[PDB]
Specification:
Belongs to the glycosyl hydrolase 8 (cellulase D) family. By secondary structure, this protein is of the alpha+beta class. It contains 13 helices and 13 strands. The strands form 5 sheets. It has a 3-stranded antiparallel sheet. The chain is globular. Bound molecules: a molecule of 5 linked components (BGC-BGC-BGC-BGC-BGC).
């Protein structure tokens, strides 16, 4: 009745006060993504005590006491003066949506109104403060409250809204109804060579900016795109189109025995070998049994230690899924394995 990988994650990465820590950074930071992944994982493990502890810290330290009053700051850590506090109060929307989804699902599954209430308020503020109408697209999720929108151009992060979460959110009406559709557009239209970019710009009157560019590569952010798609139920009509679009990533992995570290989105040219986390991300994504098993071996033989926040978090999701630790319904709900 425990999720061993999660139990080890708590010991190595989660403080007594409930903050998820990336030890690789000298400021020993906590991110809103980290908190949301901890909430998700706690929920999947049926670990309410940890869910509550992580939620408390999040509200108190990232939201000045309340997720109903503001989106959580994305970055928290040690300052030069020795004080520990928010380092950037801007939000990161991937943490935000995962946080809202976990909360809403915690409310439903544990039958607790307080989680629903916080989840709803959070989701509404997301829609109001980091969702905007873009000419040529309609409603789009910005990667954050500020810094990603100019008068005539926007920058998006395809990895931020998993299609399952998008589907889940539709039950709440506008603008989520539309976002589920524009999210598909973002994912399908910006992968000309079958690789999703970490970041991608859109300009009014011109459209997607898909010429070769520094951040127009499939690396640490984008690797999650393939994982989210693989986590979609077969009965999600969007899944087939997405698997087809991203096939060259599956083909590369099968052929080379590993996922690439970086891929030029405009040319499809690959470089390096991705870390163990990337292999975990492939487990739900790859449909070929043998290829799946090759990645499974790599995760097993190079399982992340205590000095590897990102690999570990990818592993919780990827290997977690490979081990039936959680599943998503056709409506984006958590089907728990408790
Ligand atoms: O140049 C114009 C004007 O202002 C200054 O330039 C601006 C620039 O125009 C803005 O775009 C830029 O905006 C940045 C935000 O201030 C900053 O908060 C945001 O930080 C991101 C961060 O980049 C990103 O890594 C992080 O993502 C997290 C996600 O959860 C996941 O992807 C994963 O977990 O990785 C991380 C950590 O977990 O999110 C944060 C928060 O959204 O980045 C914006 C873009 O860089 O600000 C500049 C300065 O204000 C310029 O200096 C002036 O001269 C000029 O007049």
């Amino acid at each position: 009745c425990t999720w061993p990988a999660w139990e080890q994650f708590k010991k190595d990465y989660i403080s007594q006060e409930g903050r998820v820590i990336d030890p690789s950074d000298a400021r020993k930071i906590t991110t809103s993504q980290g908190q949301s992944y901890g909430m998700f994982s706690a929920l999947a493990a049926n670990d309410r005590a940890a869910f509550d502890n992580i939620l408390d810290w999040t509200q108190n330290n990232l939201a000045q006491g309340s997720l109903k009053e503001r989106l959580p700051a994305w970055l928290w850590g040690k300052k030069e003066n020795s004080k520990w506090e928010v380092l950037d109060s801007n939000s990161a929307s991937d943490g935000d949506v995962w946080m809202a989804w976990s909360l809403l699902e915690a409310g439903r599954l544990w039958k607790e109104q307080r989680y629903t209430d916080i989840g709803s308020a959070l989701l509404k503020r997301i829609a109001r403060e980091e969702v905007v109408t873009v000419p040529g697209l309609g409603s789009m999720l910005l990667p954050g409250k500020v810094g990603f929108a100019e008068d005539n151009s926007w920058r998006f992060n395809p990895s931020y809204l998993p299609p399952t979460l998008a589907q889940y959110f539709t039950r709440f009406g506008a603008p989520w109804t539309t976002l589920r559709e524009t999210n598909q557009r973002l994912l399908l239209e910006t992968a000309p060579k079958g690789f999703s970019p970490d970041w991608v710009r859109y300009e009014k009157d011109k459209g997607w900016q898909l010429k070769a560019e520094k951040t127009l590569i499939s690396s640490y952010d984008a690797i999650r795109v393939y994982m989210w798609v693989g986590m979609m139920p077969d009965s999600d009509p969007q899944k087939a189109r997405m698997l087809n679009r991203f096939k060259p990533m599956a083909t590369f992995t099968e052929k080379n025995g590993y996922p690439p570290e970086k891929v030029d989105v405009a040319t499809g040219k690959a470089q390096g070998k991705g870390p163990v986390g990337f292999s975990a991300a492939m487990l739900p994504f790859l449909q070929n049994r043998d290829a799946q098993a090759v990645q499974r071996q790599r995760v097993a033989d190079n399982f992340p230690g205590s000095d590897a926040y990102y690999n570990y978090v990818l592993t919780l999701f990827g290997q977690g899924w490979d081990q039936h630790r959680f599943r998503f319904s056709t409506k984006g709900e958590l089907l728990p394995d408790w």
